[PDB]
Amino acid sequence: GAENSVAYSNNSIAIPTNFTISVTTEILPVSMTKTSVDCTMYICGDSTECSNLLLQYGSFCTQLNRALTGIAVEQDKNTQEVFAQVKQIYKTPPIKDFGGFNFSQILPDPSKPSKRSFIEDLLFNKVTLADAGFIKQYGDCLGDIAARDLICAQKFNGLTVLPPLLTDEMIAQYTSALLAGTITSGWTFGAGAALQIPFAMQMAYRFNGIGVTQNVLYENQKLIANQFNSAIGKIQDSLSSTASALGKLQDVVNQNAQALNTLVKQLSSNFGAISSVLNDILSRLDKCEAEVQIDRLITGRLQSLQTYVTQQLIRAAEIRASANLAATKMSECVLGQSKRVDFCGKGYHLMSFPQSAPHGVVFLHVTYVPAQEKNFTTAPAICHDGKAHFPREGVFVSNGTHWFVTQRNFYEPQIITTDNTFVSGNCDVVIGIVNNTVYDP
Amino acid sequence: KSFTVEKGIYQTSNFRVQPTESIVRFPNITNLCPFGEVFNATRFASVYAWNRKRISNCVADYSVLYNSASFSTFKCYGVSPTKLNDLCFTNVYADSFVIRGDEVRQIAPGQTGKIADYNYKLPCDFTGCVIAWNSNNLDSKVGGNYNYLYRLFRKSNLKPFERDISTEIYQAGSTPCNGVEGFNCYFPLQSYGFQPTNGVGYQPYRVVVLSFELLHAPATVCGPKKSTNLVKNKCVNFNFNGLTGTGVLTESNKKFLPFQQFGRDIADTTDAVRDPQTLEILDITPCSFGGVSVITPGTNTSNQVAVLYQGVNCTEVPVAIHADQLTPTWRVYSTGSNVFQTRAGCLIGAEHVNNSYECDIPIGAGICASYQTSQSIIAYTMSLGAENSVAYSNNSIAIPTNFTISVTTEILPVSMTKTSVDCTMYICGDSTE
Amino acid sequence: LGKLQDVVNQNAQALNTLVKQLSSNFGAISSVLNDILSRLDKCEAEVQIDRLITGRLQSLQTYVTQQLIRAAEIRASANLAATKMSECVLGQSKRVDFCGKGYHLMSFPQSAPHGVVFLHVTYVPAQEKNFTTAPAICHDGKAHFPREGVFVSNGTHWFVTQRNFYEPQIITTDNTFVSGNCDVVIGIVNNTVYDP
Amino acid sequence: LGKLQDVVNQNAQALNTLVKQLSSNFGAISSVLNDILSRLDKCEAEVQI
Numbered sequence A: 001g002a003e004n005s006v007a008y009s010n011n012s013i014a015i016p017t018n019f020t021i022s023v024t025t026e027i028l029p030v031s032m033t034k035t036s037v038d039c040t041m042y043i044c045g046d047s048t049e050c051s052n053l054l055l056q057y058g059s060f061c062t063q064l065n066r067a068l069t070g071i072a073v074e075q076d077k078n079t080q081e082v083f084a085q086v087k088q089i090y091k092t093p094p095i096k097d098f099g100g101f102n103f104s105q106i107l108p109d110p111s112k113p114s115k116r117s118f119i120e121d122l123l124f125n126k127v128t129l130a131d132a133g134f135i136k137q138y139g140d141c142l143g144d145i146a147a148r149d150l151i152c153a154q155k156f157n158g159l160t161v162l163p164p165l166l167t168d169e170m171i172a173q174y175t176s177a178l179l180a181g182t183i184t185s186g187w188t189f190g191a192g193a194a195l196q197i198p199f200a201m202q203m204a205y206r207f208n209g210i211g212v213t214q215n216v217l218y219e220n221q222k223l224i225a226n227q228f229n230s231a232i233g234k235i236q237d238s239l240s241s242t243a244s245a246l247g248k249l250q251d252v253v254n255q256n257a258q259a260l261n262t263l264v265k266q267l268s269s270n271f272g273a274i275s276s277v278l279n280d281i282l283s284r285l286d287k288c289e290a291e292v293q294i295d296r297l298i299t300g301r302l303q304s305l306q307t308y309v310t311q312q313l314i315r316a317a318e319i320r321a322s323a324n325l326a327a328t329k330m331s332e333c334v335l336g337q338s339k340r341v342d343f344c345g346k347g348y349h350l351m352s353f354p355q356s357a358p359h360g361v362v363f364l365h366v367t368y369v370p371a372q373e374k375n376f377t378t379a380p381a382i383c384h385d386g387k388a389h390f391p392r393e394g395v396f397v398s399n400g401t402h403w404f405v406t407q408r409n410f411y412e413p414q415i416i417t418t419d420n421t422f423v424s425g426n427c428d429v430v431i432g433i434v435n436n437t438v439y440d441p
Numbered sequence B: 001k002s003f004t005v006e007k008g009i010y011q012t013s014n015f016r017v018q019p020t021e022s023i024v025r026f027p028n029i030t031n032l033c034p035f036g037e038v039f040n041a042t043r044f045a046s047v048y049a050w051n052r053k054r055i056s057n058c059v060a061d062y063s064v065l066y067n068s069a070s071f072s073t074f075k076c077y078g079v080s081p082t083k084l085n086d087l088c089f090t091n092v093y094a095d096s097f098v099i100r101g102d103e104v105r106q107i108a109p110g111q112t113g114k115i116a117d118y119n120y121k122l123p124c125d126f127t128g129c130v131i132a133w134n135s136n137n138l139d140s141k142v143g144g145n146y147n148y149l150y151r152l153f154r155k156s157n158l159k160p161f162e163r164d165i166s167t168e169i170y171q172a173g174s175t176p177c178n179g180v181e182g183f184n185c186y187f188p189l190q191s192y193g194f195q196p197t198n199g200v201g202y203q204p205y206r207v208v209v210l211s212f213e214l215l216h217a218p219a220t221v222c223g224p225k226k227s228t229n230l231v232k233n234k235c236v237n238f239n240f241n242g243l244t245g246t247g248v249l250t251e252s253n254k255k256f257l258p259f260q261q262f263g264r265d266i267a268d269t270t271d272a273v274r275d276p277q278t279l280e281i282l283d284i285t286p287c288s289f290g291g292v293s294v295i296t297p298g299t300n301t302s303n304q305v306a307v308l309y310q311g312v313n314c315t316e317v318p319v320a321i322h323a324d325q326l327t328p329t330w331r332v333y334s335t336g337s338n339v340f341q342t343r344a345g346c347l348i349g350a351e352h353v354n355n356s357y358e359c360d361i362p363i364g365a366g367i368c369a370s371y372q373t374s375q376s377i378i379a380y381t382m383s384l385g386a387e388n389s390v391a392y393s394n395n396s397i398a399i400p401t402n403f404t405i406s407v408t409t410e411i412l413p414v415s416m417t418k419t420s421v422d423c424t425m426y427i428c429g430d431s432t433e
Numbered sequence C: 001l002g003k004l005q006d007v008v009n010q011n012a013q014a015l016n017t018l019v020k021q022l023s024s025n026f027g028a029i030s031s032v033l034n035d036i037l038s039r040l041d042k043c044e045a046e047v048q049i050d051r052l053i054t055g056r057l058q059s060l061q062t063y064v065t066q067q068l069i070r071a072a073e074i075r076a077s078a079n080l081a082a083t084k085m086s087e088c089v090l091g092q093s094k095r096v097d098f099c100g101k102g103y104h105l106m107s108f109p110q111s112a113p114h115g116v117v118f119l120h121v122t123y124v125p126a127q128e129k130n131f132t133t134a135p136a137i138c139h140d141g142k143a144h145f146p147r148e149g150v151f152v153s154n155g156t157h158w159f160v161t162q163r164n165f166y167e168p169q170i171i172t173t174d175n176t177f178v179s180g181n182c183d184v185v186i187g188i189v190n191n192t193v194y195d196p
Numbered sequence D: 001l002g003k004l005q006d007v008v009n010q011n012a013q014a015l016n017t018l019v020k021q022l023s024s025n026f027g028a029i030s031s032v033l034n035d036i037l038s039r040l041d042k043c044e045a046e047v048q049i
């Protein structure tokens, strides 16, 4: 990266005088495809003799089905714990009098039949084969036999994709509830019932939270609002242009589809048998050698299924980790203001907004970034009349002529007074103290 | 694999359907095969000049051979002999010759000796079968037949199914003898002496090797079975050109090349067949369509259930499930009054309810089911929760005046059982071997 | 205590599945080593027993793999429990909904078979009242903002109140602070500020 | 720095176990492909391999 050398000195401080309000998009997978498998059909193409031979294994694919059902239940659990943080389905007021902040892009659009917002619509467009499962209805596999779609081969070999419990509309409704609570009630709708608060005052709370006084909001409200709106516009273009915006989700989709395709391809292996087709074996050999060849094939295909289930358990563990992270982010950044650094964006965290996405969630972290800075001459304390003065909040600063106190993250100089500072002992122990006079009102 | 099922929705294996009928469809050919020419021949060829005969447009009855001919050895590789009636053979060649009795063992894959290296070699990956019978009363005369010759010397062993009828003098020694006989170079072909009185191992044996390959090409030599009709749109035990399987056969649209009869998908199972009689194309599908999930309150509560079929259209459920092949206890669940078409699929056995409750048994796609009391199973779109609309205004604030001190229990697992395994005892029950 | 009982059940079920999987032939003539070793001589006993050994070793490998998955999950839960004990028992956590629904006061641990139980004691504001608010107060041309709390009105007079409890107190110099003139802030109202 | 050295050891041990597991017969006549391919003709070489 760019080599840099900060101009550190023992009495020089860089204080900001201006800021920016950034909006950072960041995307977490939450769930994956609730795959299910019929062991009998996959291993044996509904032939009686192979089924009879598979009968004496029995416990193996009982275990496999148990594992896959656990995975599916875990996926539903993941989605619920991420999105169903609350249960009171709040709705936005008809009036969007939010102090100049424009939420139309993220709030629901009632014109569309589905209540996805604009950004959620873009996100659902960016991921290609999200569903590719339960949507595929029979008859298409018998009507469009010419195309030879992968899903049809998966269905004919017992590999099905179960539908998620929460539909996209229901998840979007949860998201709308979270948004409405965030932008009307502040953080209080997580800690018990939802209160109400004017949005500008909620913003003032957040600014007071990140250690800058509330007044600079009121003094720069319109500007801040404009900045926020512009940031949203930048998101509305940034994820609209490129195609790899939602890579992390599309990769998950691809892994699941690829795994199923590898399984139906692995059906083509001999596994040491005379042929990979049960029908050839059962039409070319009498009972006993058919038993032994079919046993070889059964063991091989059961091994392939066990491999698939093991990889699915690995991937489900990873998705559960990501879903736990998403739940923590929704709890700590949507439902409240997080003091943890770089947990919810690059900069001091103001708020976050959730947006649904296919098999995942998207957080728009709105954050405060100090932008323009000025050098100043500082000193850790002030000696007035033999006693030392230290600031309660802020640091001592000088423009070259006079000294003031300033809050850490914004240049708001104000004259030295008794109430700005406090006194602790004589001024002959502290290093770097300077002389000045302290106004007493 | 237990009686007491608990409350929930379970994915269950497709045992409901059972086949009921068999279909045999063999080509309309009736010419009995030339058994007379390759078995009842006046004279066979010498082993070094073994005679190859194409065979096509046959019906391999081979019960006619039971009447007269008795075969000392009849070994079949790649096919179990009991199945030879249930098959159609594509590229059938008969390789006929005569040897002595002791060398009949050399007509087999992976053998070595005079016959297996210098005269007649079979490949390792040999599909086909070998017949040999003693012929002392035909191919041996007093004084000894010398019409049967074998190649005694060769510089290198033969490749499979390779003939070598050269008669150049074999230079055994290191001095070339320029095309004449004498010392240290011999005439390679030596004549069997088949007296009618010598031992069994020096008695002439006639051998025919039938070489063919199976279930990959248009088969012209068919078995002696009797064809039946074609039952489509119903899952049957089909036997097409010996390819024996079970499934539903339907019409299709594939541009098969003239030299192809079987089509295979990515899984390599056969999917497209060409009917031998009427040169059309058929597609084979399974008759367990796929997911059939069963929804139930757990036993110790009741014994009623519902059934979801994933992805089917509620109109076409009975044909995809093949309800006509099922018992009435299944046909009640195939279709009834309690039809519901979810985007997850078709649900039968529970009445749809326009209300919305926080739900017990999830089904999918926003649908849940529960066993309510009207003591049956209901299905509904699950309720997200209480709709609310906070009364936001730009100068109104809700401040609390009182509080509560709640205590919330929440439970985390920390450890699990420290299991240990002795591999030797588990795998081997303390047996030494 | 479902979450613990499920763990117990998974471990027991896994072991039961293993001893049940001992009953499989794995392509051998029988699933019993004694039958094989009493019906066959050396060489075919070797090959049948090798088939059985490979099958049972595969079953054991499957068991160990599933145990590793489950142990990873338990380690994740144990790391979460350690973090909760550190951040909520040993201290007061500001993270929202980490240690109960509401503002976190404390937590108490309790042991349990193969797990831990946290009693999170938390503060939940219960009864609320509407009020007319304003972000600031213009006294004599300058704007007044509260240090801690928000400006509130019951309809007649204005007070400052801490965020999470209605404790109104009269406007004074020490309750508020001044920043510039009162012609830039939106929503400011007029009132008088007591000076002691 | 045990926690890191253990990771290193696990990776090295895993690779060593793999190259040691190359020495198993797995029910074949021998664990060496060269022995199998020099003692048997095509078909039984196919099945052993």
Ligand SMILES: *[C@@H]1O[C@H](CO)[C@@H](O[C@@H]2O[C@H](CO)[C@@H](O)[C@H](O)[C@H]2NC(C)=O)[C@H](O)[C@H]1NC(C)=O
Pocket (backbone or CB within 6 Å): A017, A018, A019, A020, A223, A226, A227
């Ligand atoms: C702080 O930064 C903002 C820009 O991020 C400045 O606002 C812009 O100022 C220029 C000229 O004054 C205008 O042309 C722009 O229209 C303003 N941007 C917006 C979004 O309104 C602002 O002037 C800076 N404040 C200080 C004290 O320097």
Ligand SMILES: *[C@@H]1O[C@H](CO)[C@@H](O[C@@H]2O[C@H](CO)[C@@H](O)[C@H](O)[C@H]2NC(C)=O)[C@H](O)[C@H]1NC(C)=O
Pocket (backbone or CB within 6 Å): A096, A102, A103, A104, A105
């Ligand atoms: C919030 O931002 C949008 C711009 O993205 C403002 O303009 C709307 O843009 C959309 C799509 O371009 C149109 O469907 C709307 O008709 C536009 N609004 C109007 C009044 O025409 C939108 O106005 C902004 N919201 C507010 C309250 O100002």
Ligand SMILES: *[C@@H]1O[C@H](CO)[C@@H](O[C@@H]2O[C@H](CO)[C@@H](O)[C@H](O)[C@H]2NC(C)=O)[C@H](O)[C@H]1NC(C)=O
Pocket (backbone or CB within 6 Å): A383, A433, A434, A435
């Ligand atoms: C700050 O002010 C005090 C007194 O005004 C200074 O203290 C004197 O410094 C001179 C420097 O030589 C000494 O000669 C005196 O003896 C000191 N008198 C006392 C009472 O301390 C002090 O030096 C000043 N410090 C700075 C950084 O300006």
Ligand SMILES: *[C@@H]1O[C@H](CO)[C@@H](O[C@@H]2O[C@H](CO)[C@@H](O)[C@H](O)[C@H]2NC(C)=O)[C@H](O)[C@H]1NC(C)=O
Pocket (backbone or CB within 6 Å): B155, B156, B157, B158, B159
């Ligand atoms: C096929 O014909 C070739 C050529 O005659 C044979 O290869 C030669 O065999 C002789 C005797 O072993 C050698 O002296 C030559 O060096 C070989 N020439 C080449 C180019 O290989 C070959 O042995 C014959 N194949 C069979 C199965 O008989």
Ligand SMILES: *[C@@H]1O[C@H](CO)[C@@H](O[C@@H]2O[C@H](CO)[C@@H](O)[C@H](O)[C@H]2NC(C)=O)[C@H](O)[C@H]1NC(C)=O
Pocket (backbone or CB within 6 Å): C138, C188, C189, C190
């Ligand atoms: C708060 O008080 C000030 C002065 O008492 C008001 O300012 C005057 O408002 C009237 C309204 O028409 C104007 O005619 C005067 O020109 C204003 N004088 C000055 C010095 O500003 C102010 O309007 C009051 N604001 C509220 C919300 O009550």
Ligand SMILES: CCCCC/C=C\C/C=C/CCCCCCCC(=O)O
Pocket (backbone or CB within 6 Å): B112, B113, B114
């Ligand atoms: C001196 C005795 C032999 C010493 C060498 C021992 C073993 C290796 C040679 C093995 C071949 C044995 C003779 C087989 C002859 C061909 C038989 C046939 O194909 O018809």
Ligand SMILES: *[C@@H]1O[C@H](CO)[C@@H](O)[C@H](O)[C@H]1NC(C)=O
Pocket (backbone or CB within 6 Å): A007, A014, A373, A374, A375
């Ligand atoms: C502060 O001083 C250093 C060196 O004098 C200089 O490099 C730096 O640019 C100054 N900071 C700003 C914001 O100008």
Ligand SMILES: *[C@@H]1O[C@H](CO)[C@@H](O)[C@H](O)[C@H]1NC(C)=O
Pocket (backbone or CB within 6 Å): A399, A400, A401, A402
């Ligand atoms: C520094 O601050 C004082 C305070 O009034 C001001 O008078 C002076 O002009 C300022 N000087 C510079 C260089 O900013």
Ligand SMILES: *[C@@H]1O[C@H](CO)[C@@H](O)[C@H](O)[C@H]1NC(C)=O
Pocket (backbone or CB within 6 Å): A010, A011, A431, A432, A433
């Ligand atoms: C700060 O650094 C300078 C030289 O780099 C030194 O002269 C000065 O004494 C230092 N300030 C203090 C309080 O020590």
Ligand SMILES: *[C@@H]1O[C@H](CO)[C@@H](O)[C@H](O)[C@H]1NC(C)=O
Pocket (backbone or CB within 6 Å): B028, B227, B277, B278
């Ligand atoms: C065979 O021959 C006739 C004429 O090609 C054809 O119509 C018939 O369907 C075929 N099958 C049988 C059993 O005759």
Ligand SMILES: *[C@@H]1O[C@H](CO)[C@@H](O)[C@H](O)[C@H]1NC(C)=O
Pocket (backbone or CB within 6 Å): B035, B036, B039, B040, B064, B065, B067, B068
């Ligand atoms: C073969 O020959 C014998 C007598 O020569 C005769 O009885 C028999 O029917 C013939 N069998 C065949 C298949 O031609």
Ligand SMILES: *[C@@H]1O[C@H](CO)[C@@H](O)[C@H](O)[C@H]1NC(C)=O
Pocket (backbone or CB within 6 Å): B299, B300, B301
């Ligand atoms: C099971 O049956 C017994 C006796 O009827 C009853 O006490 C118990 O509550 C039942 N438990 C469940 C889960 O149904």
Ligand SMILES: *[C@@H]1O[C@H](CO)[C@@H](O)[C@H](O)[C@H]1NC(C)=O
Pocket (backbone or CB within 6 Å): B313, B315, B316
């Ligand atoms: C099949 O499902 C579709 C819904 O997309 C429906 O329009 C159609 O009517 C159904 N087919 C029949 C025969 O009902």
Ligand SMILES: *[C@@H]1O[C@H](CO)[C@@H](O)[C@H](O)[C@H]1NC(C)=O
Pocket (backbone or CB within 6 Å): B354
């Ligand atoms: C349920 O809602 C549908 C659609 O409005 C309607 O057709 C049906 O009559 C309703 N049934 C009941 C019992 O309310």
Ligand SMILES: *[C@@H]1O[C@H](CO)[C@@H](O)[C@H](O)[C@H]1NC(C)=O
Pocket (backbone or CB within 6 Å): B391, B398, C128, C129, C130
């Ligand atoms: C506050 O005002 C709204 C509408 O005037 C009302 O619905 C709500 O009940 C009020 N809040 C309380 C605690 O009464």
Ligand SMILES: *[C@@H]1O[C@H](CO)[C@@H](O)[C@H](O)[C@H]1NC(C)=O
Pocket (backbone or CB within 6 Å): C154, C155, C156, C157
């Ligand atoms: C509002 O607060 C003032 C402060 O004294 C009080 O006098 C008045 O009675 C209160 N009015 C209402 C409606 O609460």
